[PDB]
Design an enzyme around this catalytic site. Structure first.
Site, PDB file in Angstrom:
ATOM      1  N   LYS A  77       0.982  -0.384   0.221  1.00  0.00           N
ATOM      2  CA  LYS A  77      -0.229   0.209   0.182  1.00  0.00           C
ATOM      3  C   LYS A  77       1.036   1.457   0.133  1.00  0.00           C
ATOM      4  O   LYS A  77       0.749   2.486  -0.954  1.00  0.00           O
ATOM      5  CB  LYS A  77      -1.261   0.392   0.960  1.00  0.00           C
TER       6      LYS A  77
ATOM      7  N   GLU B 224       0.387   6.616  10.951  1.00  0.00           N
ATOM      8  CA  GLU B 224       1.114   6.185  10.510  1.00  0.00           C
ATOM      9  C   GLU B 224       3.008   6.112  10.775  1.00  0.00           C
ATOM     10  O   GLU B 224       2.709   6.902  11.762  1.00  0.00           O
ATOM     11  CB  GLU B 224       1.294   6.284   8.844  1.00  0.00           C
ATOM     12  N   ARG B 225       3.089   5.124  10.227  1.00  0.00           N
ATOM     13  CA  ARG B 225       4.960   5.499  10.265  1.00  0.00           C
ATOM     14  C   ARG B 225       5.592   6.262  10.394  1.00  0.00           C
ATOM     15  O   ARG B 225       5.955   7.378   9.508  1.00  0.00           O
ATOM     16  CB  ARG B 225       5.742   4.563  10.116  1.00  0.00           C
TER      17      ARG B 225
HETATM   18  N1  LIG Z   1       6.788  -3.197  -6.313  1.00  0.00           N
HETATM   19  C1  LIG Z   1       7.764  -3.612  -5.269  1.00  0.00           C
HETATM   20  N2  LIG Z   1       8.670  -4.345  -5.309  1.00  0.00           N
HETATM   21  C2  LIG Z   1       9.792  -5.046  -4.660  1.00  0.00           C
HETATM   22  N3  LIG Z   1       9.233  -4.942  -2.998  1.00  0.00           N
HETATM   23  C3  LIG Z   1       7.593  -4.674  -2.470  1.00  0.00           C
HETATM   24  C4  LIG Z   1       7.263  -4.035  -3.723  1.00  0.00           C
HETATM   25  N4  LIG Z   1       5.762  -3.283  -2.940  1.00  0.00           N
HETATM   26  C5  LIG Z   1       5.942  -3.967  -1.947  1.00  0.00           C
HETATM   27  N5  LIG Z   1       7.337  -4.387  -1.735  1.00  0.00           N
HETATM   28  C6  LIG Z   1       7.730  -4.194  -0.297  1.00  0.00           C
HETATM   29  O1  LIG Z   1       6.352  -5.193   0.864  1.00  0.00           O
HETATM   30  C7  LIG Z   1       6.957  -3.506   1.648  1.00  0.00           C
HETATM   31  C8  LIG Z   1       5.940  -3.805   2.504  1.00  0.00           C
HETATM   32  O2  LIG Z   1       5.544  -2.705   1.562  1.00  0.00           O
HETATM   33  P1  LIG Z   1       4.260  -1.380   2.028  1.00  0.00           P
HETATM   34  O3  LIG Z   1       3.749  -1.250   1.101  1.00  0.00           O
HETATM   35  O4  LIG Z   1       5.278  -0.700   2.979  1.00  0.00           O
HETATM   36  O5  LIG Z   1       3.330  -2.163   2.892  1.00  0.00           O
HETATM   37  P2  LIG Z   1       2.072  -1.631   3.855  1.00  0.00           P
HETATM   38  O6  LIG Z   1       0.830  -1.847   2.387  1.00  0.00           O
HETATM   39  O7  LIG Z   1       1.635  -2.192   4.961  1.00  0.00           O
HETATM   40  O8  LIG Z   1       2.050   0.033   4.190  1.00  0.00           O
HETATM   41  C9  LIG Z   1       8.313  -2.851   1.882  1.00  0.00           C
HETATM   42  O9  LIG Z   1       9.008  -3.528   3.211  1.00  0.00           O
HETATM   43  C10 LIG Z   1       9.038  -3.515   0.446  1.00  0.00           C
HETATM   44  O10 LIG Z   1       9.796  -4.446   0.619  1.00  0.00           O
HETATM   45 MG   LIG Z   2       1.678   1.333   4.814  1.00  0.00          MG
END
Ligand SMILES: Nc1ncnc2c1ncn2[C@@H]1O[C@H](COP(=O)(O)OP(=O)(O)O)[C@@H](O)[C@H]1O
Ligand SMILES: [Mg+2]
Lengths: 49, 42, 469
Positions: free
Chosen positions: C160, C186-187
């Site tokens: 996300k 959020e963080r």
């Molecule tokens: N397109 C991508 N390519 C590589 N890694 C990804 C990608 N999207 C997400 N990730 C991995 O997923 C982890 C969490 O994604 P994030 O979107 O921050 O989670 P959330 O949806 O909980 O915020 C990230 O640390 C990243 O390493």
């Molecule tokens: Mg998030």
């Protein structure tokens, strides 16, 4: 005296701190009431006391 | 006819004629939980 | 005087008593003081309920550690107000309108209440104009609406935040208006990262950041979305130019509402949520909208608790959106990024009359192929792929290549892979997936479809693996 008291709530609430020993409130009350005694009756004093 | 006096220090005398230290008297205890009456300034 | 007196302090909920006739209206902002020298501060309490006998139940926006019973509570006589204007662009704000990178900035601006009514029904008009991003799966299966409401539904840590940074990079960098970012619960590391990223990409001069993080009490996380939404509403109604409104985890709004619900004395509903879940969500979401002639492209990340799309919070958020991109952990586990579930994601402009009939036909064929593959997967796992038809074996090969070709190397993922990102126009995506569903790439291996851009990168990675196209 109702009219006298409720639209003066800052002292009305004062006669409300039950945590204070009870006499304390009427202690003040007589202070204001016979401030002048054209509250010409004493029965009223006893009742609200 | 009204006592429209509003001698306010009549009120001053009462409230400001009022040190030690607030001490709470345990009201009930049990299982690691204690209720404390008093201590108006915790 | 006519000031109040703290009576009860149970966590973030504080009861106050006022003299008769001086009860503050609902949602007023009251000030109290914490005098303990190491935790000295000024509490802002928002009036939540009128309890009776002059009592008033309020929610504190700061931690109440150090608050004393009987201290004086000042009624400000108005709700929480935040700065508004062209002067909030380029700065970071609290949920209370205090600038963070420059304390004291914005004290003289016009201030707007954070509690407003949604636009009336006569000013609402459906938006059916496509917003082209550059991602294959988004442009194909869930085309975003320009001036409409978009969401990224997802479990814990799927894509996300990365996808919303990707959309900040794609839509907002070359955008001809004003952006507002609300990080709702959020963080803080991510907030600082976004601040620095917008500062180095020269997007900050067009953005107004509003941050209420996870370390804040539930009042701040209830009202930060409203603060940023009020800034966006000012940009939409008074200035009137093409607002973008990002909201990282609008779910934290509902969660903070549920953290104080029982403390406010409400019986809990089904899954422990407040009984007023849908109506609070509707009072907030109906303000995030575009009126006739005034546009707000809204984009919200929506946390799905425990990967359960039947949870009442995402299930209620679903009804407020024009395009929902639903990320999945089953797709995350396969290494496909963005981890979009193509069979659950949706859009209202995926219509033969809006996107054209070729776009629609290609999208429907992709979805049909992927649904048949999902239907076969268990048979393949147990009895093996050799027990299928030749029809079905062909379909399974095509479907695996399609599932891999929907993934892409995003610009905001160069930190997780080291490989820069790519952009694919929508016509190239339609042509490519038409060829995929017809079977023109049944000879290229499963890889070389994995994390690439358009067709020329497919050719390059196929020759890097020994194949034509
Ligand atoms: N397109 C991508 N390519 C590589 N890694 C990804 C990608 N999207 C997400 N990730 C991995 O997923 C982890 C969490 O994604 P994030 O979107 O921050 O989670 P959330 O949806 O909980 O915020 C990230 O640390 C990243 O390493
Ligand atoms: Mg998030």
């Amino acid at each position: 005296f109702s009219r006298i008291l409720d639209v003066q709530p800052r002292l009305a609430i004062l006669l409300g701190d039950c945590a204070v020993p009870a006499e304390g409130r009427v202690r003040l009350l007589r202070k204001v009431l016979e401030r002048a005694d054209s509250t010409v009756n004493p029965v009223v004093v006893a009742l609200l006391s | 006819t009204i006592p429209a006096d509003d001698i306010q220090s009549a009120i001053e005398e009462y409230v400001s004629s009022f040190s030690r230290e607030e001490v709470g008297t345990v009201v009930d205890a049990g299982d690691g939980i204690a209720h404390v009456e008093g201590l108006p300034s915790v | 005087d006519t000031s109040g007196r703290v009576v009860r302090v149970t966590g973030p909920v504080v009861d106050v008593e006022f003299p008769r006739g001086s009860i503050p209206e609902l949602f007023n902002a009251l000030h109290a003081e914490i005098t303990f020298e190491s935790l000295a501060k000024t509490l802002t309490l928002e009036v939540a309920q009128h309890l009776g006998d002059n009592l008033v139940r309020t929610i504190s926006l700061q931690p109440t550690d150090g608050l004393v019973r009987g201290v004086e509570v000042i009624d400000t006589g108005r709700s929480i107000s935040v700065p508004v204007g062209e002067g909030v662009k380029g700065h970071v704000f609290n949920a209370l309108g205090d600038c963070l990178d420059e304390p004291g900035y914005g004290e003289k601006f016009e201030h707007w209440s954070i509690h407003r009514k949604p636009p009336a029904f006569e000013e609402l008009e459906p938006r059916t104009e496509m917003l082209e991003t550059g991602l294959k799966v988004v442009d194909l299966l869930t085309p975003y609406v320009r001036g409409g409401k978009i969401a990224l539904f997802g479990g814990a840590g799927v894509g996300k935040t990365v996808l919303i940074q990707e959309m900040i990079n794609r839509i907002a960098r070359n955008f001809g208006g004003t952006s507002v970012f609300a990080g709702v619960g959020e963080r803080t590391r991510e907030g600082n990262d976004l601040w620095v990223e917008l500062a180095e990409a020269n997007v900050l001069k067009d953005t107004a950041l509003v941050f209420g993080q996870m370390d804040e009490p539930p009042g701040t996380r209830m009202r930060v979305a409203l603060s940023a939404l009020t800034m966006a509403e000012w940009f939409r109604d008074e200035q009137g130019q093409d607002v973008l409104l990002f909201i990282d985890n609008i779910f934290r709004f509902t969660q903070a509402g549920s953290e104080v619900s029982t403390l406010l004395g409400r019986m809990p509903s089904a899954v422990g949520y407040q009984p007023t879940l849908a109506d609070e969500m509707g009072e907030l979401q109906e303000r995030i909208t575009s009126t006739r002639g005034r546009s707000i492209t809204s984009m919200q990340a929506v946390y799905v608790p425990a990967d359960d799309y039947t949870d009442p919070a995402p299930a209620t958020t679903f009804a407020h959106l024009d395009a929902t991109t639903e990320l999945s952990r089953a797709v995350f586990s396969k290494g496909i990024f963005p981890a979009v579930d193509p069979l659950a994601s949706s859009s209202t402009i995926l219509d033969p009359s809006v996107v054209g009939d070729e776009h629609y036909r290609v999208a429907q064929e992709v979805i049909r192929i992927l649904q048949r593959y999902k239907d076969l997967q268990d048979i393949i796992a147990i009895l093996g792929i050799d027990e299928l038809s030749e029809e079905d074996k062909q379909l399974v090969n095509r479907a695996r290549r399609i599932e891999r070709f929907l993934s892409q190397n995003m610009m905001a993922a160069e930190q997780f892979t080291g490989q820069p990102g790519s952009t694919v126009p929508v016509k190239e995506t339609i042509e490519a997936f038409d060829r995929l569903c017809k079977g023109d790439f049944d000879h290229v291996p499963e890889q070389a479809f994995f994390l690439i851009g358009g067709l020329d990168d497919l050719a390059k990675k196929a020759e890097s693996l020994g194949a034509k196209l």
